[PDB]
């Protein structure tokens, strides 16, 4: 008997799930285990209520191709055990010892989301073409419906905006290598934009041809398709040379092959298929063998190619490639089982809302294609049921700098695709708040549709056509009744929204203390907050995108010093390049409490500071949202040796400072901050301009931002209480405070101008 190797998990691998440390969130559970030493191993999985795994009480899933699995049926409520072994295909038996036994509970509260097995999915997949978006029955019904009314699903708008332009256009010439195979940003981008247009032309002409019964459009589509099929698979548009170009060529070939299938001669089909298979194999070998996302599921670049590239290519190829059958199974099973380690059960996305936009964009495409083709609906999984609200609470219309993480749009209004993604989730859930969000994001942002960051990535007219055909339209509902508080526990984000519909009263507050640390597109921003109030960005996410790996990115935006957060002993949270340490440099939401007039959120960022400073023993931050009007921030820090405390807050313009306060006024709103209590000593307050130690060429011609720094003398214990009062410039506000520090606790009494009161009581 072979001895099964059961490797230790790492910071960037899958874990062994389900278990008592990781109870299932769905029924049936999503199973994963680290693979044996032999990468060409097959597995057998056993599930039983009997931890002895007696034959009659046990479910057995034999001959599994991969180290992850979702069963095709929900389990009865109860207590279960599971193990796995290596499986010998020929003799039909386990050829290794059984793994560690792990346990889990199934209750009725768990959403029931089974994955139809390989046989059922293969049987559900029709043999005819087309397959992508519409089957032949649907295509027929849609053609009849467009014959009776050219405005059916907005077809007339789609034809005009997304088909018509390609009728005049000469077939895109094959992209050329760079001067001396040395990549330049302009040429790299133009190249993948060129390949994106090849998707649009081939796909939209073919669709128009089939919908309108027009052979001439089919002929025009075919012309682009054969030209692209003739491009050098080892040339400039290969995955190896420019993967962005390579990805797009595969998608173009897939839509053309699928929708022109019957229009192409058998020989033309052979030409296209051969090149489609060859290019698809390049992508599949990268996702499966190199990126190895079934072991390393955080690789979003590889997950994107699985979703956006593999899905359409493999669907187009079904029945005419055994390889493609296997790659489609992997794709479907991966999205059903392992997608995604960035996703929280409450709908949060650990990388932040900008990366939610791009990530969801390509997940949505895969899910829509798969639902149509085999009738399996990924959106039924609870993450997708919940995730529409993440951008609703972190990227509300009008907010520019009021969230966290890498954001290529930082400083601008929320991107169009955020609304479009959320509309998809409106369709799924029937939620009218999601529709409202779509309407308002679109209104604020349209006119940027043809800009390279949208046009080079998705045709929104096609998104519309597909959405209107596939989903019932949801009526927008005012966010006036939207819950003020949304907690995303798994990722450690807490958000408050007030008066979202009102441009003069709208508040967006977000607090972050994440178990994900500074990993990947997250920063050293645990126990940090951002604040948009009275319709303006006040306490901001600072700096500019510039580029990944710029000084602005690495030395400002990743670092705690750019955040509305504390520094201890002159040091921030670990935010360098070591991925394991980045993940270790973590926070967590300790508690959230809510009653009328008082929201209390507690964050613990101890590990986050400890990684870079072993002197640190405890780092807690409380944020109080008081009487729907102002904030009280409580910073509690313990160290083994005297360390000073710095309290930072960032703004678009220069703050003015005082003896125990600072103030910033923007265009229509403003806020003041006051240090009402500091056990470690009276804070010294400074206003700082710009981005220290950052190359000014990186932000040339752009306005500098500012921050206030309040420094408390070195102490082993800090308790700092900061009152933050936002206001409309039309009605500036003042909050009064009294400290009662006698007793076993420090009591702070707050009152407004109408003697409305709040009492903070902090045990000593
Ligand atoms: Cl979450």
> Helix or strand or coil: residue 18?
coil
Burial of 170 from C-beta contacts in 10 A (0-12 / 13-18 / 19+): exposed
Q: Which whole-number Å values give the CA distances from 428 to 378, 425, 652, in the listed order? A: 10, 5, 38
Q: Which whole-number Å values give the CA distances from 668 to 257, 687, 708, 728, in the listed order? A: 55, 21, 20, 6
Closest CA to 388 of 351, 350, 325, 432: 432
How far, in Å, is the centroid of ligand 1 from the Cα of 350? 8
DSSP state of 721: E
CA atoms 49, 53, 54, 56: torsion sign: positive
C-alpha of 409 from chain center:
15
| Pairing mode of beta strands 598-604, 102-106 | unpaired
Please confirm whether the linkage preceding 130 is cis (ω < 30° from 0). Answer: yes
How far, in Å, is the centroid of ligand 1 from the Cα of 492? 7
**Strand ranges (DSSP E) for 436-527?**
485-488, 493-498, 507-512
| Pairing mode of beta strands 102-106, 656-657 | unpaired
Task: Say how far apart CA 360 and CA 347 lie, in whole Å.
Answer: 12
Closest CA to 491 of 385, 360, 346: 346
Rounded to 5 degrees, what angle do the CA atoms 193, 285, 175 make?
25
Tokens 């933050």 locate to: 724
Q: Which whole-number Å values give the CA distances from 196 to 459, 466, 734, in the listed order? A: 9, 18, 55
Task: Say how far apart CA 81 and CA 328 lie, in whole Å.
Answer: 30
CA atoms 407, 409, 412, 415: torsion sign: negative
Q: Are 754 and 697 in contact (CB under 8 A)?
A: no
* Element at 649 (helix H, strand E): strand 630-651
Written in H, E and C, the secondary structure of 558-623 is CCHHHCCCEEECCECCCCCCCHHHHHHCCCEEEEEEEECCEEEEEEECHHHHHCCCCCEEEEEEEE
Paired tokens of 363:
């997940």
Q: Give me the half-sphere count of Cα atoms (radius 13 Å) on the Cβ side of residue 248.
A: 26
Closest CA to 356 of 399, 392, 315: 392
How far, in Å, is the centroid of ligand 1 from the Cα of 488? 4
Task: Say how far apart CA 609 and CA 526 lie, in whole Å.
Answer: 9
In degrees rounded to 5, what are phi and psi of residue 259?
-85, -20
Task: Say how far apart CA 560 and CA 434 lie, in whole Å.
Answer: 33
Dump the DSSP string for 169-196.
PPPPPPP---GGG---HHHHHHHHHHHH
How far, in Å, is the centroid of ligand 1 from the Cα of 434? 17
| Pairing mode of beta strands 598-604, 588-595 | antiparallel
How far, in Å, is the centroid of ligand 1 from the Cα of 390? 8
Buried/exposed code over 716-725 (b: 16+ C-beta within 10 A; e: otherwise):
eebbbbbbbb
Burial of 331 from C-beta contacts in 10 A (0-12 / 13-18 / 19+): buried
| Pairing mode of beta strands 706-728, 630-651 | antiparallel
Burial of 233 from C-beta contacts in 10 A (0-12 / 13-18 / 19+): middle
Paired tokens of 605:
């960022």
Instruction: Compute how many other C-beta atoms are within 10 angstroms of the C-beta atom of residue 252.
Output: 26
The stretches of 446-553 forming alpha helices (DSSP H) are 452-455, 460-470, 551
Cα distance between the two ends of the chain: 62
As beta bridge partners, residue 665 has: 670
Q: Are 491 and 348 in contact (CB under 8 A)?
A: yes
Task: Say how far apart CA 390 and CA 394 lie, in whole Å.
Answer: 6
How far, in Å, is the centroid of ligand 1 from the Cα of 152? 38
How far, in Å, is the centroid of ligand 1 from the Cα of 200? 35
How far, in Å, is the centroid of ligand 1 from the Cα of 704? 34
How far, in Å, is the centroid of ligand 1 from the Cα of 372? 28
Q: Are 574 and 585 in contact (CB under 8 A)?
A: yes
How far, in Å, is the centroid of ligand 1 from the Cα of 293? 22
How far, in Å, is the centroid of ligand 1 from the Cα of 340? 12
Task: Say how far apart CA 129 and CA 143 lie, in whole Å.
Answer: 15
* Domains of the chain, CATH where assigned: 1-117 (2.60.40.10), 118-482 (1.50.10.100), 483-763 (2.70.98.70)
How far, in Å, is the centroid of ligand 1 from the Cα of 650? 26
Task: Say how far apart CA 144 and CA 137 lie, in whole Å.
Answer: 11
Q: Greatest CA separation found in the chain?
A: 91
CA atoms 201, 202, 203, 208: torsion sign: positive
How far, in Å, is the centroid of ligand 1 from the Cα of 468? 29
């Amino acid at each position: 008997q072979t001895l099964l190797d059961e490797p230790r998990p790492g910071s960037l691998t899958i874990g062994y799930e389900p278990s008592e440390e990781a109870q299932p969130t769905e029924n049936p559970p999503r199973f994963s285990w680290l693979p044996d030493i032999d990468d060409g191993a097959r597995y057998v999985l056993r599930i039983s209520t009997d931890p002895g795994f007696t034959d009659k009480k046990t479910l057995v899933f034999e001959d599994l191709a991969w180290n992850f699995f979702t069963p095709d049926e929900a389990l009865p409520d109860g207590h279960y055990h599971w193990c796995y072994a290596l499986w010998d295909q020929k003799s039909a038996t386990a050829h290794s010892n059984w793994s560690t036994v792990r346990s889990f509970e199934i209750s009725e509260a768990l959403p029931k989301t089974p994955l139809p097995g390989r046989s059922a999915r293969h049987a559900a997949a029709q043999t005819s073409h087309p397959r992508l978006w519409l089957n032949s029955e649907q295509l027929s019904a849609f053609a009849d419906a467009v014959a009776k009314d050219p405005n059916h699903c907005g077809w007339a708008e789609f034809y005009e905006k997304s088909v018509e332009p390609w009728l005049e256009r000469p077939v895109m010439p094959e992209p050329q290598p760079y001067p001396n195979n040395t990549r330049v940003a302009t040429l790299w981008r133009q190249m993948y934009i060129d390949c994106q247009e090849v998707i649009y032309a081939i796909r939209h002409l073919a669709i128009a041809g089939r919908v309108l019964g027009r052979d001439d459009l089919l002929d025009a589509s075919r012309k682009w398709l054969l030209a692209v099929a003739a491009w050098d698979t080892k040339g400039a548009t290969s995955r190896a040379y420019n993967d962005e170009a390579g990805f797009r060529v595969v998608v173009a070939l897939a839509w053309g092959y699928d929708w022109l299938y019957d229009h192409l001669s058998e020989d033309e089909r052979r030409t296209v298929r051969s090149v489609l298979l060859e290019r698809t194999r390049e992508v599949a070998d990268h996702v499966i063998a190199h990126a190895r996302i079934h072991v390393f599921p955080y690789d979003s670049h590889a997950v994107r190619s699985l979703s956006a590239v593999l899905t359409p290519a493999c669907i187009a190829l079904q029945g005419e490639s055994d390889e493609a059958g296997e790659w489609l199974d992997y794709t479907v099973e991966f999205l059903a089982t392992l997608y995604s380690p960035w996703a929280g059960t409450d709908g949060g996305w650990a990388e932040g809302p900008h990366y939610w936009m791009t990530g969801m964009a390509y997940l949505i495409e895969a899910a829509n294609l798969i639902r149509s083709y085999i009738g399996y609906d990924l959106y039924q999984r609870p993450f997708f049921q919940n995730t529409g609200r993440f951008p609703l609470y972190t990227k509300a219309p009008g907010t520019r700098r009021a969230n966290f993480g890498d954001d290529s749009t930082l400083g601008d209004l929320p991107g169009l695709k955020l609304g479009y993604n959320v509309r998809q989730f409106a369709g799924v859930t029937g939620n009218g708040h999601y529709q409202w969000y779509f309407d308002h994001i679109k209104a604020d942002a349209t006119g940027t549709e043809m800009a390279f960051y949208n046009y080079g990535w998705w045709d929104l007219n096609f998104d519309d056509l597909v959405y209107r055909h596939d989903y019932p339209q949801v009526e927008a509902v005012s966010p006036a009744d939207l819950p003020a508080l949304a907690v995303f526990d798994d990722i450690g984000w807490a958000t408050i929204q007030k008066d979202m519909e009102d441009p003069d009263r709208h508040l967006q507050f977000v607090f972050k203390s994440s178990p994900y640390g500074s990993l990947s597109h997250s920063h050293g921003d645990q126990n940090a907050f951002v604040l948009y109030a009275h319709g303006e960005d006040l306490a901001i996410q600072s700096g500019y995108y510039v580029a990944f790996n710029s000084q602005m990115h690495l030395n400002w935006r990743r670092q705690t010093r750019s955040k509305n957060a504390v520094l201890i002993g002159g040091k921030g949270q670990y935010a360098e390049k070591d991925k394991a340490l980045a993940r270790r440099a973590a926070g967590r939401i300790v508690s959230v409490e809510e009653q009328p007039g008082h929201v209390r959120i507690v964050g613990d960022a101890t590990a986050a500071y400890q990684v870079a400073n072993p002197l640190v023993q405890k780092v807690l931050r409380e944020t109080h949202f008081v009487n729907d009007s102002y904030f009280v921030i409580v910073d509690e820090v313990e160290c083994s040796e005297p360390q000073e405390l710095q309290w930072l807050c960032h703004t678009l313009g220069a703050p003015q400072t005082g003896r125990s306060s600072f103030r910033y006024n923007g265009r229509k709103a403003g806020f003041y901050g006051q240090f009402v209590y500091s056990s470690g000593g009276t804070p010294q307050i400074s206003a700082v301009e710009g981005f220290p130690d950052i190359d000014p060429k990186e932000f040339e011609g752009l306005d500098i931002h500012h921050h206030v720094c309040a420094t408390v003398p070195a102490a082993t214990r800090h308790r700092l209480v900061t009152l933050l009062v936002p206001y409309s410039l039309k009605e500036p506000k003042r909050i009064f405070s009294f400290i009662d520090d006698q007793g076993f606790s420090t009591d702070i009494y707050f009152s407004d101008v109408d003697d409305e009161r709040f009492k903070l009581s902090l045990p000593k």
